[PDB]
Design a binder for this molecule. Sequence first.
Ligand SMILES: Nc1ncnc2c1ncn2[C@@H]1O[C@H](COP(=O)(O)OP(=O)(O)OP(=O)(O)O)[C@@H](O)[C@H]1O
Ligand SMILES: Nc1ncnc2c1ncn2[C@@H]1O[C@H](COP(=O)(O)OP(=O)(O)OP(=O)(O)O)[C@@H](O)[C@H]1O
Lengths: 246, 743, 743, 150
Amino acid sequence: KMILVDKVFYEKILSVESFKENIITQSAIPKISNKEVRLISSGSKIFYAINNTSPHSHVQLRLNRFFLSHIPLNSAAKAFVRGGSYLKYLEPHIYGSSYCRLDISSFFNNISFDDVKQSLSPYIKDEYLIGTEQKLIDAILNSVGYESPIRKDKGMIIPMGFRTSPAISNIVFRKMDLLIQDFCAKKGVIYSRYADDMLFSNPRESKLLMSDYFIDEISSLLSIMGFNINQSKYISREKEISINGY
Amino acid sequence: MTIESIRVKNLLSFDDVILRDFRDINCIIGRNNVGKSNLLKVIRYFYAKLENKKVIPLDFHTNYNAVGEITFTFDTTRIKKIVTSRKNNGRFHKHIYNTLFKSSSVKLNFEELIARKNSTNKSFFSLTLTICKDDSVMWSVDDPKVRSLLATLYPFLYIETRHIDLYDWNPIWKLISNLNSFNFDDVDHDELVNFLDEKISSRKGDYKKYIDRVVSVIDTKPYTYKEKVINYIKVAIKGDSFVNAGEELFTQSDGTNSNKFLETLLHLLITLTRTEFISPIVYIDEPEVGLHPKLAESFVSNLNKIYSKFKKTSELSGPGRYKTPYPNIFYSTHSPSILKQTIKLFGKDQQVLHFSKKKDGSTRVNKINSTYSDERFLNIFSDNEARLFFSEYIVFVEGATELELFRNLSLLNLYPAFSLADIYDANEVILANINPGYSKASIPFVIIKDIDTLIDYSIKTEKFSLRPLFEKMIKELTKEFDYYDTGFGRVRKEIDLFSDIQSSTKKHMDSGLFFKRFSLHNLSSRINKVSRKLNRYFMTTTIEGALINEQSLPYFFNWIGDVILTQMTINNPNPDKFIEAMRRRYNIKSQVVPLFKSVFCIGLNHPVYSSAVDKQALRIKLSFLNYLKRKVYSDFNNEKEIVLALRLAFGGKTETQYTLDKLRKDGEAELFREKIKNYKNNELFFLEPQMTKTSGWVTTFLNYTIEKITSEESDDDRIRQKLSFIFPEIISIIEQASSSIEA
Amino acid sequence: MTIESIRVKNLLSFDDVILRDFRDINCIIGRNNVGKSNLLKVIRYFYAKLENKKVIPLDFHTNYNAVGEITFTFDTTRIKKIVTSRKNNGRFHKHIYNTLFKSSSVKLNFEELIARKNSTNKSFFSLTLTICKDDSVMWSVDDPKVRSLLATLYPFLYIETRHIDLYDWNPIWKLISNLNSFNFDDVDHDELVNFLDEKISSRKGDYKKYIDRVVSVIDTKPYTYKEKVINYIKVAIKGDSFVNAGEELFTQSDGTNSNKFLETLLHLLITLTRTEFISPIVYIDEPEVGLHPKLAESFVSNLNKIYSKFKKTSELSGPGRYKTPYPNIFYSTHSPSILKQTIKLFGKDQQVLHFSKKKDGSTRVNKINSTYSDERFLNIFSDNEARLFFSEYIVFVEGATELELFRNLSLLNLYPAFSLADIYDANEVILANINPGYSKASIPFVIIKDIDTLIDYSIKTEKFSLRPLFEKMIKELTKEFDYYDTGFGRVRKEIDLFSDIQSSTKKHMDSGLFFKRFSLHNLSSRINKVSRKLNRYFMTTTIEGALINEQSLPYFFNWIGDVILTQMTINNPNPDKFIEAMRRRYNIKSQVVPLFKSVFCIGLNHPVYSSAVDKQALRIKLSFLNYLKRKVYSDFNNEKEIVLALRLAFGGKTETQYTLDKLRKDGEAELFREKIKNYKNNELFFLEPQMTKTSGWVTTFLNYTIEKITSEESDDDRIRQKLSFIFPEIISIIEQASSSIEA
Amino acid sequence: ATLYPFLYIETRHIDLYDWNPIWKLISNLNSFNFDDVDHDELVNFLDEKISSRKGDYKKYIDRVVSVIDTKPYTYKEKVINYIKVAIKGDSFVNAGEELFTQSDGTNSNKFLETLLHLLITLTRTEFISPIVYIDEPEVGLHPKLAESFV
DNA sequence: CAAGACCAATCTTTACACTCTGTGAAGTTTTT
DNA sequence: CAAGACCAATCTTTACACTCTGTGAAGTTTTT
DNA sequence: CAAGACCAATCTTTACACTCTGTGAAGTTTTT
Ligand SMILES: Nc1ncnc2c1ncn2[C@@H]1O[C@H](COP(=O)(O)OP(=O)(O)OP(=O)(O)O)[C@@H](O)[C@H]1O
Ligand SMILES: Nc1ncnc2c1ncn2[C@@H]1O[C@H](COP(=O)(O)OP(=O)(O)OP(=O)(O)O)[C@@H](O)[C@H]1O
């Protein structure tokens, strides 16, 4: 039995008190304003941190607790999931003889919001939360997503450090996890993923993982929803590989 | 060994399950619908695909995975020793070398090969079968000869005892054919025919002509190896059809037939696997179905007898004892007798696997501790202890009174969930050697004790003293020895005050029957909150004190009224004249106590009296009820004193954790003890036989209370809330156990 | 009621077996191969021949009888009430009257008919089927309509749970058809067709044309009644195919499928039999096969819930409660859980039948007492107590030490027969309310007690006194109250001296540690010889005294030597320097006791020391062994004093039935008590933790003794005779139990 | 698959004494509406027709429904149930005689004859066009009987 | 003199009511 | 320029020895 | 630069009408 959310589900157990005022006065749930989000710089990377006092943080936390934790995922996703760990990502490959490692460039920034809407649509009933103005799914994504002030062109963005961003990333990438897992299985390759770092291993005596064809195929798949492969971190070795020291 | 590990990913009811560290006997236990036979189906499909049979692929646990994987890690150390050696130059050995261990020693160099040879040899062969979403199957080794040879070397023998054909034991022979390996080049079909013809002929040559005719007429296919060995066995032995103890199978029973079938097959397996390097894996479902408990115990006993008769150790050696590894025997049972005998007769060579299907639907496999270092516990191990393995929630208690309470039928009627929890009284040494904390995740449990086991207050010194159990609990609870900061600061504070409590002193009142300001309830609550992490619950007082609180005084008193009205009779065969004589000699008002002593006495049988006798008895009983009400409310200042007196009479403890016997020995509270003895010997003599712990007063009390409150209130939620109010202690423990059971 | 009696003569495994006094639930228990299913086959054949089916006749038990008879006594009191009444003028009622109760009330006259009508009606119908040697069958009633009507009125519903088709629950519907009775004259096949056509048509008349076409093409047979009711049910309800908890059957398990099948069928049976006068007899084989113990308990619990939800009594009444008799439910089980829950939840409405095949081969059916008047025992009833029903020989004991002894694995290895006897410690009240003497013939038993429970010698008064158990035993043993002369004169003499023993006095020596001339062995032998008729065996002393006798002193001492050599280690992380320091400070000769106290201490873990350390430890241990030998043989005059001291230290009794605690309380034997305390606190300190009863010294003692004597002697008959010599008391009880088990 | 059903018989392995597989094939043939017929109107009709006291049969059906756990009917089961309730008899009889007393060739011939007759008769009014495949329509049949079958 | 054993076929056998539960206040041969 | 994926058939796969147990010391069209 | 291969779930699939038949004119580590 899949998880379904209706108006009462949002109003009673999700919102509780964060958006009581909006639901009693039938006022639209607002966007996450820049006042609630502080912009940290770490390296060349930029992190977005929400303030705890805002009701959006609390509703994000209860969304993570009660909603995003029930949607089924793909077993190749070993990160940000209950029971998933790096050692699990690095284990299925002990059976392999040749190893290859790929990376997705700016995984969290390149997640299209429309893909998130499409991925979350079957698990949320299509209703009108606030009169005839804002739908329930629209309110939930208003809680989850954010608009980047630095780059207003790309519009709504799932930012780094928004509590619910990792689970949403796993859910929205389940489609590609299935596609790439099917391709690798038909090629006889063991596949696993941690966040955006993808690891493939061939247990047979073959040069498939060292060929340009494999990279081209994975990139061609990743272009379906607009991802790209970081060419600097691409690695392919035989009989021994080292990933971040392991 | 035979199999190092078995891993299933996303097939049937398994999400990601790995089974390893197999022993000689592997008992599989678990609730209905947890996947115990799903392991059988997975292994059976893996071995069917090993021999390139055409079968339907198994279903995926969830369809959000594009793959489903089965991994088998065969242990080929002994086969490597067998075949690598220069003496074994046979053709089967040469095939095994050229198929498995060639192309694996090819890649290694001289240094690594010599290191493998000289050191402790440990070689494994990992084979992975992956089922894609479109029903295609892909192996990790693309040489079918390797897979066929692996199937031959490590055969899978498989029985579902439920669907056994009792009256035809033919499937035994096939399995025997799988076991033993030897040479057949020398035996042709010409020498045998000549031998038989020479033996069977009044004129030489006739039988050969007959066989030539039969061969010429028919058209057949050359024998396979297994058919060859089966034919040679069946010709060699005296009889083919099976007979149970001299009687035909169809006349015998069904349980006897199944028991004998399984017994002969397992005996043949262990007997015949001694001399060969073929290491089978055998899987029995329900080895106990249709078997009397005595028969299941005898089945396991005979299995262990055969197992130990061929086992060679440093002490046992000589003719008939082999070092050859035993086949891996899995059997899934739902019978405590099978598990009990397995544990008691195998010890360190058995393993108990617990299968539980969680909340989402995945199967979890855990290892339950079944090895005990205490010989006394092994000998005293019985059906009651082995029943614990099948429990869902174990509530360990200390005395028999808790067993009497928690097993109450009426009480369990209103709390059906707690009916699934087995209560087992555990001594400290028994609780130590059972090791229920090792399982925890597999079989959740709770240990229920009294706070007296922690702190022993002294009335003379006005000091608490810490029992060694408290020090040991604190020692496990001072986790901070090698840790990092967490939200455990409250825990450290609580342990600090628990250590501080030793130096503090508390005054007592009424010669040591109450606390001036210390709240034992608060200390109990803090202790339970802290020690919930250790699955231990401590009650403020004894169980009798838990039943008899200040709030339970009315209903209990009503019970006294009822025990005053119904269950005594007149102690004379002539109720009329006897009641008249006692009314004459003893007054109604001045001498009511001796009159009731002479007239009424407790009796299970209730003879029917005349209406006037009933009226007189009712008037006397009502007068005695009023007199007892007045006397009880007069001789005791407040309700608390009455509750304490009732607790002490039945064998409870005071607020200072002192029993009646303890108070008598120490000599304190002379006035209260004298009042209690006076009430027992003068007014409450009829309740004196029911004063003891084992007298069963708890059962009658709870039954009457439940019946009365159900008479008062109809709704079941109302009745449960009334129970929670009236017994805040017991209902809390039942609620906690039920909540842990539900999840 | 439904069936008064069932009698089988010379058919299958039955010689002459009569089953009667059926209750609402009849649990059938017994060993494998005793005929439990043979009753099923007999009833099934009787009912198949009732409906004039063509089946092979059943085989005769012995061929020296020309006949084999099956007798059924149907209880037609309620049907007579149903049909005789003037209101029920229906056609089914008229048929029942004109077939069964006509020609039976015909023979009676007006007086007898009125007497039957007015008084408590009790009418029975006896039907006998006789199978001759030439396979012909003869009934005692020659009207086949009577037999068919009896089959219809009292249908037999029959399940073997072993051979259930799990994935197709169709056989439920057939059984439902057997249950309920109502009218079908009004429903033709024309009104229904018009109704369906009016409901199913865009243009009126099409569906009727379709049905007319189908009817015209096919050729069929008119419906039978059961097919009619099945069709109407299946059209009426929402779905036909069965689903377990929202999931398809083939995905679910096998145990779950069988449990749900049985549960739904029994629920339907009890629910639907409420309103009708048809009283089925249902027989379930193995209601527990493939079921977890928790699931079997839940199955019985739900069965009892449904049974009690429709039961009407003087207190429970109102809407939904019926007085209609419940169907006779027999089920044969081999699971203690089913029997335990049946007893606990039914009480007086259940019956336990024991099937045993004797020595010649005939089946015996007995009734085991399963109703208890004690509510406390019912609530405390658990798996351990319910296991007793499946026992072959119950050896009731008193304390946990006997449980430790009689369950010893090594001891049971040499006496396999005694492995079939279950040992169960029984309190006096538990033994009283179990009532093991009621069965006796069914489940043989023995009650093992100490002679202290009979006679309590007083050292101060030099008098024996008789405990009330002795008076009660004598009271059952003075059979001569209303009897005739027999060879019981010896018994009367023995009872005369047993009464005389009270007035006699016996002197004691060594301050009350021995008897001058009285032989407690002779008294014990006389008591046991007399009381063997009551299945009670009394030991001369406690079990510790039985283990430690004058003959067992050598081996026990050897154990001390071994417990001196192996299981202690050095109480220091630095054995070399510590042993040197203690050798320097404490002399070898003068201060050996403190040196051994400081150096050696009991420890399960044995760290490996240097060779010189081993040599020093061995020399010290040998010196201590010699010193203890000398001290023990010096401080005690004879071997008997040493044996008595060893018994007293471990918690035994003297010849005068006095424990160490009892002697300390009474104050006698100050010198012996002081010597024992000195030996415990100075020389035998290491054995002090093992001095207690529950410390498990019995297990270690017996294990070591068995291993040592098996090392000395090889033959098993020799080893058993050595065991009999060394422990004359325990081996005698084991031999008696095994001999009673064999017969 | 629904529009062009495949009906398939191997006459060699026909179960002569039980003609149940006919009904299934009949269910494949004809198509009509079942929204109007619920399980409430039918129960009320039957209870009104089958009761000495109104309401008893409805109580009985409610009890049976409450005890059991089932799955909603498929369409083919629905039409089979309605046929089997509507017609006078379910079990098949050859020329007034029970099947087990009759022969094997006669049983197979009558089975095939009734099935083909039902197929052609019932396929007239509907747009469902089955494909039927018979193996050995002649096995066990006298030449005269095979000619008569055709 | 008198007697056990006196074909096999032949017809709606499934509930009622007040009581929602209880049942009631012009051939041969054979028989001849 | 260069590369993963390089048909399907085709041959005794059942034990050895010292060690009774351990494995070792003169047509059209298409390709063209 | 740009592209085939873009999860698995999620909802009555059995006849209509005029035409009785035809459908239509305050931790480490990892991602980062
Ligand atoms: N094809 C399948 N796809 C998914 N889950 C399945 C499938 N077949 C079975 N299961 C699941 O596996 C379990 C089947 O019970 P299984 O026989 O594996 O357990 P079991 O412990 O052997 O049962 P029992 O105790 O009765 O012998 C159920 O949880 C069922 O939901
Ligand atoms: N045809 C027969 N003739 C004589 N004795 C028979 C015959 N059939 C069975 N028996 C006897 O009856 C018993 C058959 O076992 P039965 O099934 O009756 O017992 P059971 O208790 O049901 O067995 P289980 O406990 O395995 O279910 C055996 O003692 C067998 O000797």
